[PDB]
Amino acid sequence: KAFKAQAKEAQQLRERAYLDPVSHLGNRAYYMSQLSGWLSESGIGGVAILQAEFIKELYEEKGYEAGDGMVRELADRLKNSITIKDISIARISTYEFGIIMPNMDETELKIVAESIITCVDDINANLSLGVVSNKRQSSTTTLLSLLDNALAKAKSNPELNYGFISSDKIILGKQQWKTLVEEAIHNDWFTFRYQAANSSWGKTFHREVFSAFEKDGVRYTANQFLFALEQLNASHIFDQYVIERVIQQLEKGELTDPLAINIAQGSISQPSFIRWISQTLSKHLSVANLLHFEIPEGCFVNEPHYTALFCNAVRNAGADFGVDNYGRNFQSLDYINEFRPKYVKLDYLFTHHLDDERQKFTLTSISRTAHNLGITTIASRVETQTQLDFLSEHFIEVFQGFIVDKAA
Ligand SMILES: [Mg+2]
């Protein structure tokens, strides 16, 4: 099949496999997959369960038309009223909704809770809302238990609008992360890990860079502050420091493999950064061949102008780029044709928890779309050999994760 036929097939399968037809939100499996990936990777943020009792009544009293129409109306309201980065909005039941808000503190979660209540108020007992503030990585069983208690508390005392639970640890503000990151950038406190992405034979396609730094014997990883830098607009300050450092180790002459650097969405949106990247890569043209710039899919779909500027400047200096979280935005896959990325890193959603028939088709279709263009398909966070062999039957060619990090 040609691209447009293949891409449209991939977008159809992705919609039928992970989206609720009526609400057009994520379905039950989507919510289940999103929850497991966020909890196992960071678990920092908030999760909420909205029990739209008024939708339940319409289904039992007025029929499917009334309930369906109200589900769609509330779904569009939530989808438009809660614009939070990397948020997950899913319909986990006929009248229940699950929301995942990564990297959000209790004060921001409680604001979103009143916003979800305001959505229901605009669309005329009515609801029960349970909000859980999560600080550390835990099991999906433990978090779902906390949500179940958050709901119980909202019903136990309807003197409040929503039940709130926190588990457990006084966190850091956004400006506190900035001064903390700027200090690590000041003294070169940052440590770098290189996770290899290999083919089934062990051929290293590239190594994704992971950053961390220490203070007081406490270790902070990039995903603990990357959002605060973006929300403070200062994400370019960190991405420039990483690129500078990665160029040094490349100029030590030892690393023969390309290095993948994650570029923040808020970094490419800044014209100063795209200028800074073209000057840096011009004065380090020797090692640009070993530079892979991992662009999130959000930049291609929502900032295609700056991304085209960044991609053009990157490829005219000998470097290349790839798509990170490929397919995650549930939008058009056209940009694969217009940008022709060197690789696509499939999002966690389309690679894990493939328990249903249609999920596997979506993987093959979404992967063929890039494969049939000569674009290397990569699956990350691959933790098992049986997982690797399974993904290789669905047009995944490069693998990254625990199975690669255990070998030798
Ligand atoms: Mg990445």
Residue numbers in the entry: 221 to 344, 353 to 396, 399 to 638
Paper excerpt:
LapG-containing operons also harbor a gene that encodes a conserved c-di-GMP receptor, LapD.
To gain unbiased insight into the structure and regulation of V. cholerae LapD, we determined a crystal structure of its cytoplasmic domains comprising the S helix followed by GGDEF and EAL domains in the absence of c-di-GMP. Crystals diffracted X rays to a maximum resolution of 2.7 Å. Despite the low sequence identity, the structures of V. cholerae and P. fluorescens LapD superimpose with an overall root mean square deviation (RMSD) of 1.7 Å, indicating structural conservation of their apo states. However, the autoinhibitory S helix-EAL domain interaction responsible for P. fluorescens LapD autoinhibition at low cellular c-di-GMP levels is well preserved in the structure of the V. cholerae ortholog. More specifically, residues F223, A227, and R234 of the S helix (corresponding to F222, A226, and R233 of P. fluorescens LapD) nestle against a partially hydrophobic interface on the EAL domain. As seen with P. fluorescens LapD, this contact places the GGDEF domain atop the putative c-di-GMP binding site on the EAL domain. Based on structural work, we show that the Vibrio cholerae LapD ortholog adopts a similar autoinhibited conformation utilizing the same intramolecular interfaces as determined for the related P. fluorescens LapD, despite low sequence conservation.
